[PDB]
Design a binder for this molecule. Structure first.
Ligand code: OGA
Ligand code: MN
Length: 235
């Protein structure tokens, strides 16, 4: 079924119905007036960030054998992986861009809902996810709560509860134990038969929308367009 969408719910309703039980939701009317929503174009990103060095993941999925991580300027990333007919999938993923480029922090806000946590605001981690259509983040789980805010473009997102972990066949290794062995959109059901019947939620996340990913909820994300998302990891 589809992740529910709520317009600016109260703090208490979010706490009781979503945060405490660990249920996903999309929040509307919250980030739709970030200055980023109107300001961030490729040209703006080049002007403010183009000369800075960023880590880039190259390859279809980080679970692939040919996948690698490199460094280049934001201008180079845009030129090679976005505008010119790219040879490979590149993704400026999981990067603390706002600590590197404080000017861009002026264009975003931490959602007020994160104050319902038991952690310090100073310890919230903010990451950029910027890439072309077709980037894929394989199914995995994270150790904090997350607000994933969509700024540019759309993402297809699949969510599996931590109760379903058995049917997701986590990797055995220590580096990949938070990651499923299954390719969500083309699962090998001969090797991973339990996956087929496992229930899930899905959504297309559009600009101005916030997805709440409860701590340890398994998530899979594919960009449908040129995309820019901002995540907030909080407790
Ligand atoms: O946006 C993506 O491709 C993947 N995002 C995340 O895994 C996250 O925000 O924790
Ligand atoms: Mn994640």
């Amino acid at each position: 079924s589809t992740v529910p969408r709520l317009h600016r719910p109260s703090l208490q309703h979010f706490r009781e119905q979503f945060l405490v039980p660990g249920r996903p939701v999309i929040l509307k009317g919250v980030a739709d007036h970030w200055p980023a929503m109107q300001k961030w174009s490729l040209e703006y990103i080049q002007e403010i960030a183009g000369a800075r060095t960023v880590p880039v993941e190259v390859g279809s999925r980080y679970t692939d054998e040919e996948w690698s991580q490199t460094l280049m300027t934001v201008n180079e990333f845009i030129s090679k992986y976005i505008v010119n007919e790219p040879r490979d999938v590149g993704y400026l993923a999981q990067h603390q861009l706002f600590d590197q480029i404080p000017e861009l922090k002026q264009d975003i806000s931490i959602p007020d809902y994160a104050s319902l946590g038991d952690g310090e605001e100073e310890e919230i981690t903010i990451c950029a996810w910027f890439g072309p259509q077709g980037t894929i983040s394989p199914l995995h789980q994270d150790p904090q709560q997350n607000f994933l805010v969509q700024v540019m473009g759309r993402k297809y997102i699949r969510l599996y509860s931590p109760q379903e972990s058995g049917a997701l066949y986590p990797h055995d290794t220590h580096l990949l134990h938070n990651t499923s062995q299954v390719d969500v959109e083309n699962p090998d059901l001969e090797k991973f038969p339990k996956f087929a019947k496992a229930p899930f939620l899905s959504a297309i996340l559009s600009p101005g929308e916030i997805l709440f990913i409860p701590v340890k909820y398994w998530h899979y994300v594919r960009a449908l367009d040129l995309s820019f998302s901002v995540s907030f990891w909080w407790s």
